[PDB]
Design a protein around this motif. Structure first.
Motif, PDB file in Angstrom:
ATOM      1  N   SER A 195     -24.732  14.955  -2.800  1.00 44.96           N
ATOM      2  CA  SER A 195     -24.146  15.186  -1.474  1.00 44.96           C
ATOM      3  C   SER A 195     -23.862  16.670  -1.320  1.00 44.96           C
ATOM      4  O   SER A 195     -23.645  17.361  -2.313  1.00 44.96           O
ATOM      5  CB  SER A 195     -22.812  14.435  -1.337  1.00 44.96           C
ATOM      6  N   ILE A 208     -21.034  19.092   0.428  1.00 48.12           N
ATOM      7  CA  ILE A 208     -19.618  18.898   0.765  1.00 48.12           C
ATOM      8  C   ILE A 208     -18.941  20.233   1.086  1.00 48.12           C
ATOM      9  O   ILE A 208     -19.446  21.285   0.712  1.00 48.12           O
ATOM     10  CB  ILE A 208     -18.861  18.238  -0.416  1.00 48.12           C
ATOM     11  N   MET A 265     -20.567  23.143  -1.121  1.00 50.65           N
ATOM     12  CA  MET A 265     -20.881  22.800  -2.499  1.00 50.65           C
ATOM     13  C   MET A 265     -21.808  21.605  -2.561  1.00 50.65           C
ATOM     14  O   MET A 265     -21.932  20.853  -1.594  1.00 50.65           O
ATOM     15  CB  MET A 265     -19.604  22.490  -3.270  1.00 50.65           C
ATOM     16  N   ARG A 309     -22.261  18.094  -4.623  1.00 51.97           N
ATOM     17  CA  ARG A 309     -21.638  17.140  -5.518  1.00 51.97           C
ATOM     18  C   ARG A 309     -22.713  16.251  -6.118  1.00 51.97           C
ATOM     19  O   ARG A 309     -23.421  15.559  -5.389  1.00 51.97           O
ATOM     20  CB  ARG A 309     -20.615  16.287  -4.760  1.00 51.97           C
ATOM     21  N   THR A 313     -23.209  13.105  -8.608  1.00 46.59           N
ATOM     22  CA  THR A 313     -22.492  12.026  -9.290  1.00 46.59           C
ATOM     23  C   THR A 313     -23.426  11.220 -10.194  1.00 46.59           C
ATOM     24  O   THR A 313     -24.450  10.706  -9.742  1.00 46.59           O
ATOM     25  CB  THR A 313     -21.774  11.089  -8.302  1.00 46.59           C
ATOM     26  N   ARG A 321     -23.905  12.423 -17.618  1.00 50.63           N
ATOM     27  CA  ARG A 321     -23.508  13.750 -17.156  1.00 50.63           C
ATOM     28  C   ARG A 321     -23.589  14.773 -18.284  1.00 50.63           C
ATOM     29  O   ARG A 321     -24.138  15.856 -18.106  1.00 50.63           O
ATOM     30  CB  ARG A 321     -22.103  13.736 -16.560  1.00 50.63           C
ATOM     31  N   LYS A 345     -16.188  17.609 -12.663  1.00 51.50           N
ATOM     32  CA  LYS A 345     -15.055  16.960 -12.012  1.00 51.50           C
ATOM     33  C   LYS A 345     -15.084  15.473 -12.332  1.00 51.50           C
ATOM     34  O   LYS A 345     -16.151  14.877 -12.441  1.00 51.50           O
ATOM     35  CB  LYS A 345     -15.087  17.175 -10.494  1.00 51.50           C
ATOM     36  N   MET A 398     -18.803  13.548 -12.262  1.00 51.28           N
ATOM     37  CA  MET A 398     -19.352  14.545 -11.329  1.00 51.28           C
ATOM     38  C   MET A 398     -19.665  15.921 -11.923  1.00 51.28           C
ATOM     39  O   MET A 398     -19.012  16.378 -12.862  1.00 51.28           O
ATOM     40  CB  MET A 398     -18.422  14.733 -10.122  1.00 51.28           C
ATOM     41  N   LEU A 446     -20.189  19.635  -9.902  1.00 51.07           N
ATOM     42  CA  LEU A 446     -20.225  20.362  -8.642  1.00 51.07           C
ATOM     43  C   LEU A 446     -21.051  21.615  -8.819  1.00 51.07           C
ATOM     44  O   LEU A 446     -20.985  22.266  -9.861  1.00 51.07           O
ATOM     45  CB  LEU A 446     -18.821  20.764  -8.189  1.00 51.07           C
ATOM     46  N   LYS A 490     -20.915  25.045  -7.210  1.00 53.58           N
ATOM     47  CA  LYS A 490     -19.967  25.824  -6.422  1.00 53.58           C
ATOM     48  C   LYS A 490     -20.672  26.791  -5.463  1.00 53.58           C
ATOM     49  O   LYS A 490     -21.877  27.013  -5.588  1.00 53.58           O
ATOM     50  CB  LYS A 490     -19.010  26.564  -7.363  1.00 53.58           C
TER      51      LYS A 490
END
Length: 132
Positions: A6, A8, A15, A17, A19, A26, A52, A56, A58, A60
């Protein structure tokens, strides 16, 4: 091994994301990209990837921190990866096909960057499912 992606945030600080299905998936991805970045001289020690909870990663925002997410001149979700081979590696390992965006090659302008087609990913829009 399915992954959700996604875009966001806001226009100044967008950013990505990412998941994963679980923490092990991960970790496996993070180990891969950190090893690849080191091999290519791309410094990702603190930017742009950030973990995160739960499950997740991210990406940045890019700043002037050149690597990372930004909104392109054409209102596209863009990610600067510093080097072509690093971009290609990250996209391949996420299951993000080059057909989902503009992906300049070799010596073309923006060869370090991926630009999601507007119709595929938008800021605060629905997620994409990849690696399914």
């Amino acid at each position: 091994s399915s992954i959700s992606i996604s875009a966001i945030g806001n226009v100044d600080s967008p950013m990505i994301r990412i998941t994963f299905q679980n923490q092990t998936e991960r970790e496996f991805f993070l180990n891969k990209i950190t090893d690849k970045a080191k091999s290519l001289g791309v410094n990702i020690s603190t930017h742009p990837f950030e973990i995160k909870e739960p499950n997740m990663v991210l990406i940045k925002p890019s700043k002037y921190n050149k690597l990372g997410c930004y909104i392109s001149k054409n209102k596209e979700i863009a990610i600067n990866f510093g080097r072509t081979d690093f971009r290609d590696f990250v996209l391949s390992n996420l299951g993000v096909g080059s057909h989902l965006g503009t992906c300049p090659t070799k010596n073309e302008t923006g060869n370090d960057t991926f630009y999601f087609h507007q119709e595929n990913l938008s800021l605060n829009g629905p997620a994409l499912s990849v690696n399914t």
